[PDB]
Symmetry: D2
Subunit: 115 residues, 4 copies
Amino acid sequence: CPLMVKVLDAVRGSPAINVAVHVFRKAAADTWEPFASGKTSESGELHGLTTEEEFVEGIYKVEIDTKSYWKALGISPFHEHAEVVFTANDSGPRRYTIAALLSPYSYSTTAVVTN
Amino acid sequence: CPLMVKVLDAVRGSPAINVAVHVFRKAAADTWEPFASGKTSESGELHGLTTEEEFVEGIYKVEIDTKSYWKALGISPFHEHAEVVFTANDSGPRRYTIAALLSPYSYSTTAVVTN
Amino acid sequence: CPLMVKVLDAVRGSPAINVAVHVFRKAAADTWEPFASGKTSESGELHGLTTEEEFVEGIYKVEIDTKSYWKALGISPFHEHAEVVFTANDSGPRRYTIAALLSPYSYSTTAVVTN
Amino acid sequence: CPLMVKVLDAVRGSPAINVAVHVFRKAAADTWEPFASGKTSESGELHGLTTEEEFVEGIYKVEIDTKSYWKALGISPFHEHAEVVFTANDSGPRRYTIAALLSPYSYSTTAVVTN
Ligand SMILES: O=C(O)c1ccc2nc(-c3cc(Cl)cc(Cl)c3)oc2c1
Ligand SMILES: O=C(O)c1ccc2nc(-c3cc(Cl)cc(Cl)c3)oc2c1
C-alpha cells in the first residue's frame, strides 16, 4: 500500500466517509492521465489505490471531491475539490499518506512520507 | 500596535466577529496575570491590546473564547477555548500578529512576526 | 478589488514574499484559461488581480507556486504547487480573499468572503 | 483506549516522534489536576493514556510539548506548547483522538470523536 488517503471532517469531528478521490499521473504529452480512484471508508481512509509495481516515478495529482461530500450532507461549500500535486518516487519507492482536514470554506492537507 | 489578533471562521468563510480574546502574561510565581483583552471587530481583528512600552519580553497566553462564538451561531463546538502560548523576544523591531482559523472541532493558529 | 490572495509562511512566521500566483477561469471546452497573475508583496498579499467588471461568475483556479518559494529559501518541499479551485457566485456585493498558510509538506487554505 | 493523541510534523512530512504529552483534568477547586502523560511513538501516536474507568466526565487539557520537540531537532520555535481544552464524556463515554500538525510558527489541531 504505497499510496493512502485519509480525510477528516472538522465540523462534525469525524472521519469524512464516502469521499470520492481521483488520482492522476502527468503524461509525456503534458496531460493528466487517470491513474487510480476510490472512496474513503467508514474510518475516512482509502486503501488499495495502487501497487508498488504500478506506482512508478512521476508527478501525481490526488483530487479529493470535497464539494460532493459537503453537498451530500446538504451543505453548499466554497471549493470545487481539494487537489494535492507532488512528485513521487524520485529517489526510489516511498510510502505516501495524503491527509486532508475539511471545513465548508477551508481545507488543510499534509503528507506523511516514509521509506 | 506590537500585538494584534486576527480570527477567521472556516465554516462561514468570514472574519470571526465579536469573539472575546484575553491575553495574559506569565508572572514569577508560575501564575497567569491578566494583561489585555477585547472583542474582535467586524474584520475579525483586535487592535490596540498593548503599547510598545507595556509589551516586554516574557511568556504570553492568548485565550480565544471559541465556545461562546460557536454557541452564538447555534453551532455545537468541541473546544472550551483556543489558547496560544508563546515567548515575546526582543531582537530588533517586532510586531506580532496571532492569527487563528476556527472550525467547530478544529482550529489552526500561526504567528506573523514582522519588522 | 473583488479578488485578493494572501500567503503566509508557517516555518519562518512571516508573510510569504515574492510568491508567484496564477489565476485561471474555466472555459466552456473544459479548459483553464489564464485570467490574472502576479507576485505577492512584502506583506504576502497580491492586490489588483482583477476588476468588478472582469470578475464574472464562474469556476476559478488560484495556483500558488509553493515549490519555487521553498527552493528560494533552500528548503526541500513536497508539493509542486498549491491549487485552490472555487465557484464565484453573485449574491449581493462580495469580495473574495483566498488565504494560504504554507509549510514544506503541508498547506492550509481558507476563503474570506465579505460585503 | 478512549483517549489517543496523534502528532505529525509538517516540515519533515513525518510522524512527530518522542513528543511529550501531558493531560490534565479540571478539579472541584478550579485547578488543573495531573491526569495522564506519555510520549508519542515512532508512528507519532500515543496510546494507553487512560482507561474507560478512569476517564470520567470532566474538562480535560491535553498539552503537547511542541517547544521541546522543535528544540531537540535543533530549531527555535514560536509556541511554548499546543493546548487542547475540551469537555469529555458529557453524554456518556466516547473515544477521542486528538490530532496535531506542527510547524515551527504554527500548529493545527482536530478532534475525532466516536461512539
Ligand atoms: O494579518 C492578516 O491580516 C491576516 C490575513 C489573513 C490571514 N489568514 C490567516 C490564516 C490562514 C490560514 Cl489558511 C490558516 C491560518 Cl492558521 C491563518 O492568517 C491571516 C492573517
Ligand atoms: O488518526 C490517524 O490515524 C491520522 C492519520 C493521519 C492524519 N492527518 C491528520 C491531520 C491532517 C491535517 Cl492537514 C491537520 C491535522 Cl490537525 C491533522 O490527522 C490524522 C490522523
